[PDB]
Structures are given as structure tokens and as C-alpha cells.
Design a protein around this motif. Structure first.
Motif, mmCIF file in Angstrom:
data_model
loop_
_atom_site.group_PDB
_atom_site.id
_atom_site.type_symbol
_atom_site.label_atom_id
_atom_site.label_comp_id
_atom_site.label_asym_id
_atom_site.label_seq_id
_atom_site.Cartn_x
_atom_site.Cartn_y
_atom_site.Cartn_z
ATOM 1 N N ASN A 139 -8.823 14.458 -3.042
ATOM 2 C CA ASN A 139 -9.505 13.770 -1.674
ATOM 3 C C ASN A 139 -9.090 13.054 -1.619
ATOM 4 O OD1 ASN A 139 -13.284 14.200 -0.900
ATOM 5 N ND2 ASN A 139 -11.196 16.267 -0.861
ATOM 6 N N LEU A 140 -8.518 12.568 -0.960
ATOM 7 C CA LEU A 140 -7.540 11.259 -0.848
ATOM 8 C C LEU A 140 -6.668 11.605 0.240
ATOM 9 C CD1 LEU A 140 -7.031 9.471 -4.346
ATOM 10 C CD2 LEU A 140 -8.420 9.266 -2.215
ATOM 11 N N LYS A 141 -6.418 11.124 1.247
ATOM 12 C CA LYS A 141 -5.472 11.174 2.668
ATOM 13 C C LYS A 141 -4.415 10.193 2.246
ATOM 14 C CE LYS A 141 -6.944 11.310 6.833
ATOM 15 N NZ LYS A 141 -7.433 11.473 8.689
ATOM 16 N N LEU A 142 -3.369 10.172 2.545
ATOM 17 C CA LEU A 142 -2.388 8.788 2.352
ATOM 18 C C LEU A 142 -1.287 9.243 3.851
ATOM 19 C CD1 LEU A 142 -1.022 6.147 0.431
ATOM 20 C CD2 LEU A 142 0.331 7.861 -0.589
ATOM 21 N N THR A 143 -1.492 7.589 4.522
ATOM 22 C CA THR A 143 -0.899 7.352 5.797
ATOM 23 C C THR A 143 -0.036 6.983 5.779
ATOM 24 O OG1 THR A 143 -2.279 8.944 6.432
ATOM 25 C CG2 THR A 143 -0.676 7.882 8.346
ATOM 26 N N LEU A 144 1.700 7.314 6.152
ATOM 27 C CA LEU A 144 2.390 5.633 6.647
ATOM 28 C C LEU A 144 2.403 5.250 7.690
ATOM 29 C CD1 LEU A 144 5.625 4.359 5.592
ATOM 30 C CD2 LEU A 144 6.369 5.835 6.730
ATOM 31 N N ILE A 145 2.204 3.846 7.173
ATOM 32 C CA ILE A 145 1.927 3.040 8.567
ATOM 33 C C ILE A 145 3.221 2.485 10.101
ATOM 34 C CG2 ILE A 145 0.434 0.758 9.819
ATOM 35 C CD1 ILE A 145 -1.466 3.435 9.341
ATOM 36 N N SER A 146 3.774 2.054 8.202
ATOM 37 C CA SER A 146 4.623 1.299 8.942
ATOM 38 C C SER A 146 6.110 1.353 8.161
ATOM 39 C CB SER A 146 5.121 0.291 9.952
ATOM 40 O OG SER A 146 4.747 -0.774 9.147
ATOM 41 N N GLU A 147 7.491 0.559 7.636
ATOM 42 C CA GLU A 147 8.685 0.515 6.876
ATOM 43 C C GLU A 147 9.620 -0.253 7.109
ATOM 44 O OE1 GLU A 147 10.603 3.666 4.704
ATOM 45 O OE2 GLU A 147 10.873 4.759 6.407
ATOM 46 N N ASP A 148 9.627 -1.682 6.782
ATOM 47 C CA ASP A 148 11.242 -2.447 7.048
ATOM 48 C C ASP A 148 12.147 -2.028 6.143
ATOM 49 O OD1 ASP A 148 11.776 -4.800 7.734
ATOM 50 O OD2 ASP A 148 11.035 -5.701 6.150
ATOM 51 N N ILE A 149 13.137 -1.885 6.191
ATOM 52 C CA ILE A 149 14.354 -1.187 5.347
ATOM 53 C C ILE A 149 15.277 -2.070 5.065
ATOM 54 C CG2 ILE A 149 15.911 0.453 4.748
ATOM 55 C CD1 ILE A 149 14.726 2.342 6.568
ATOM 56 N N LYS A 150 16.034 -3.163 3.911
ATOM 57 C CA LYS A 150 16.417 -4.204 3.564
ATOM 58 C C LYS A 150 17.380 -3.522 2.710
ATOM 59 C CE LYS A 150 13.955 -7.471 5.501
ATOM 60 N NZ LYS A 150 15.014 -7.884 6.514
ATOM 61 N N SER A 151 18.895 -4.921 3.043
ATOM 62 C CA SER A 151 19.949 -3.807 2.221
ATOM 63 C C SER A 151 19.257 -3.385 0.672
ATOM 64 C CB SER A 151 20.766 -5.347 2.531
ATOM 65 O OG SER A 151 19.821 -6.589 1.918
ATOM 66 N N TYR A 152 18.223 -4.383 -0.421
ATOM 67 C CA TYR A 152 18.000 -4.604 -1.581
ATOM 68 C C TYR A 152 16.942 -3.724 -1.652
ATOM 69 C CZ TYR A 152 21.813 -8.027 -2.398
ATOM 70 O OH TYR A 152 23.115 -8.359 -2.256
ATOM 71 N N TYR A 153 16.207 -3.170 -0.973
ATOM 72 C CA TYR A 153 14.870 -3.607 -1.244
ATOM 73 C C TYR A 153 13.930 -2.585 0.607
ATOM 74 C CZ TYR A 153 13.044 -7.150 0.506
ATOM 75 O OH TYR A 153 12.514 -8.832 1.567
#
Ligand SMILES: C=C(C)[C@@H]1CC[C@@H](C)[C@@H]2CCC(C)=C[C@@H]21
Ligand SMILES: [Mg+2]
Length: 287
Positions: A139-153
């Protein structure tokens, strides 16, 4: 830096494998009876990687409270970590339940979903903002809010909602994406930079529940991350920094989860990271 002359002496003598085997011999051996019950067989990714009964994380639910996850509590350092395996297709709802119940702020992921052409981990978070994930068994909901893609991580911000009570929390996901398929990184610089990004986020701080750390089994790369963090914390706190002994810190962590640090080059890499990170915290702030 006693450790640094210990390092040079072990390299010179070519005895990393012998040092590592001695750690394996003296490591604790506690019972894992809950992990081995037949009803829990599909909750474990590897038959030889189980949590000790005395340090395992219990889900807050009647029926089955089992998850393959261990609380590693470092008393002197004043830091706690949860180490877990990469979630399974049927344990993704348990994973996020554990995050909710333990009040964790960050998840640290040290593997890719596919490595060496095999699935090391389920896709347990949403890849697109507009397609959230529902875990109905918990009974949990999970939402992507934002993401920052860098070279190593990559760093993701996620929202986790308890559909029972409609409370929401923000979770930071820290994904180290360039650990080589074989071996260890040649330079610890990018791993240390990753560690300090996790620290700056607040996710490792005592106002929050323990950070959740995982790779595929939750012992190899995972153990390297916690070992380096705790060692650097002890050197900051202590009246005598060169009194910090990596091998005794590793054996103390192994009282809480078996198998931490899985090869002799992971052991060697751990020294390298602590030695190099110690420069950056003895007053030498420059980068
Ligand atoms: C953490 C480090 C010891 C190193 C110092 C030198 C840089 C090339 C590398 C990448 C850039 C950042 C901000 C620091 C990293
Ligand atoms: Mg023993």
C-alpha cells in the motif's frame, strides 16, 4: 599515516590475499534461522547471503516480517547503516516498506540493474515522472520527482506516499553507475566524490533513519561504502587520527552482516579510499 605504511608494506610483500583470508577466519558466525525458513526461500536472492537473526530488519506487519537486510550500528562513530540485497521482483514492496518504517532519507545503489549480461536487481523505482509505481501488497505509491545524471553517478529525488495514511516523504536515490564489471575502480577519486555527495545531502545524519545501502548481494561494494565512511568519521572525531585500524573496523561491521568486503582487491581498494579521503579531511579542503 600508520595505515599508509601498513599499505606500502603489504603491497611490497604481496600479501593482500593472506591478509584477507585472516579476516575471513576471524569474522563472526551468528545464526540465520529466520532467513532459512522454507516460507522465506523466495525472499532471498542468494542462498549463501543471509542476515543474522540478531541484527535483521523486521517488517512491521503480521504474516511475514522477513526481508534480507541488516542494521549495522557503529557505536563509537555514531553512524548506522542498513545493508540489503538488490530487491527481487516480489520483494520491491517490502523494500519500500522497510524504507518507510525505518524513516530513511537516502537509498545508495552501487550496482547497475544488468551486469555481465544478467539481472542483478529488479527495476524497483520509476524511470519516468508521469508513470508512477504502485506497490499494492504494502500500500505504497512511488513517484519520480526529478533526476540529475552525471558521468559516474545519478541522483534521483523520489516521493514515497503511504496510501493508508496519505503521508508523503521525499527520498533521495544515489546511484553509482560506473563500478567496473570486474575488479575495482583504478582511482578512488570518483568513489570518494560520490561518498561526499551522499554526506552533503543529509541522508547520513542522525536526524534521519539509517541510510539504505545495496548492491546485488549487499556485502561487496556495499561493505566498501560503509567501511570507508565509518573509518573517515573516526579519524575526524578522534584525538589520534592514525589510531584508526581498518581491519578492526571491518571485523566490527562483520558482527552485524556476514561477508562484507568480498575480495582482496576490494580490501585493498578500501585502504586506498580511506588514505586518500584522509588527505581531504585533515585540513586540506582544496578541490
Ligand atoms: C574528490 C577528489 C579527491 C577529486 C579531486 C580532483 C577531480 C579531478 C575529481 C573530479 C572533480 C571533483 C569535484 C573532485 C574529484
Ligand atoms: Mg571466528
Amino acid at each position: 599515516m600508520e595505515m599508509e605504511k601498513e599499505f606500502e608494506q603489504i603491497d611490497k610483500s604481496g600479501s593482500w590475499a593472506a591478509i584477507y583470508q585472516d579476516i575471513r577466519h576471524e569474522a563472526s558466525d551468528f545464526p540465520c534461522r529466520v532467513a532459512k525458513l522454507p516460507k522465506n526461500k523466495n525472499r532471498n536472492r542468494y542462498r549463501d547471503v543471509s542476515p543474522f537473526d540478531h541484527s535483521r530488519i523486521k517488517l512491521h506487519q503480521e504474516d511475514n516480517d522477513y526481508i534480507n537486510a541488516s542494521l549495522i550500528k557503529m557505536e563509537e562513530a555514531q553512524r548506522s547503516y542498513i545493508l540489503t540485497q538488490g530487491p527481487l521482483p516480489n520483494t520491491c514492496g517490502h523494500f519500500w516498506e522497510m524504507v518507510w518504517e525505518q524513516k530513511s532519507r537516502g537509498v545508495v545503489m552501487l550496482n547497475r540493474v544488468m551486469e555481465k549480461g544478467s539481472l542483478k536487481c529488479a527495476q524497483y523505482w520509476p524511470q519516468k515522472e508521469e508513470k508512477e509505481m504502485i506497490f499494492e501488497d504494502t500500500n505504497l505509491k512511488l513517484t519520480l520527482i526529478s533526476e540529475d545524471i552525471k558521468s559516474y553517478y545519478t541522483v534521483r529525488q523520489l516521493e514515497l506516499e503511504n496510501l493508508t495514511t496519505q503521508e508523503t516523504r521525499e527520498i533521495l536515490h544515489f546511484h553509482y553507475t560506473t563500478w567496473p564489471d570486474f575488479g575495482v575502480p583504478e582511482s578512488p577519486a570518483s568513489f570518494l566524490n560520490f561518498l561526499f555527495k551522499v554526506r552533503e545531502s543529509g541522508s547520513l545524519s542522525p536526524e534521519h533513519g539509517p541510510v539504505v545501502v545495496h548492491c546485488s548481494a549487499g556485502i561487496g561494494r556495499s561493505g566498501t561504502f560503509c567501511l570507508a565512511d565509518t573509518c573517515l568519521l573516526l579519524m575526524d572525531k578522534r584525538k589520534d587520527p592514525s589510531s584508526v585500524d581498518i581491519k578492526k573496523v571491518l571485523l566490527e561491521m562483520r558482527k552485524f552482516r556476514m561477508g562484507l568486503i568480498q575480495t582482496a582487491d576490494q580490501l585493498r581498494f578500501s585502504y586506498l579510499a580511506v588514505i586518500e579521503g584522509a588527505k581531504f579531511i585533515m585540513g586540506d579542503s582544496s578541490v
